[PDB]
């Protein structure tokens, strides 16, 4: 699995999006676009995330 960590907050402004807050660890599910990836949070919610707002989890 591929995990990322949020660097910034994201409100989730389209309904496909997954909102998140800085520090959230998210699992990457799919990369349909270069900068928008499908991700899942610690509650199991899913949606699209802006890649610029996250880093590799390590």
């Amino acid at each position: 699995a591929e995990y990322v960590r949020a660097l910034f907050d994201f409100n989730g402004n389209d309904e496909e999006d997954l909102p998140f807050k800085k520090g959230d660890i998210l699992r990457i599910r799919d990369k349909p676009e270069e900068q928008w990836w499908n991700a899942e949070d610690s509650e199991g919610k899913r949606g699209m995330i802006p890649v610029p707002y996250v880093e590799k989890y390590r």
Partner: peptide, 10 residues
């Protein structure tokens, strides 16, 4: 500190 640009969608 400064937030990146929110990227364009397809």
């Amino acid at each position: 500190y400064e937030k990146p640009a929110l990227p364009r969608k397809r």
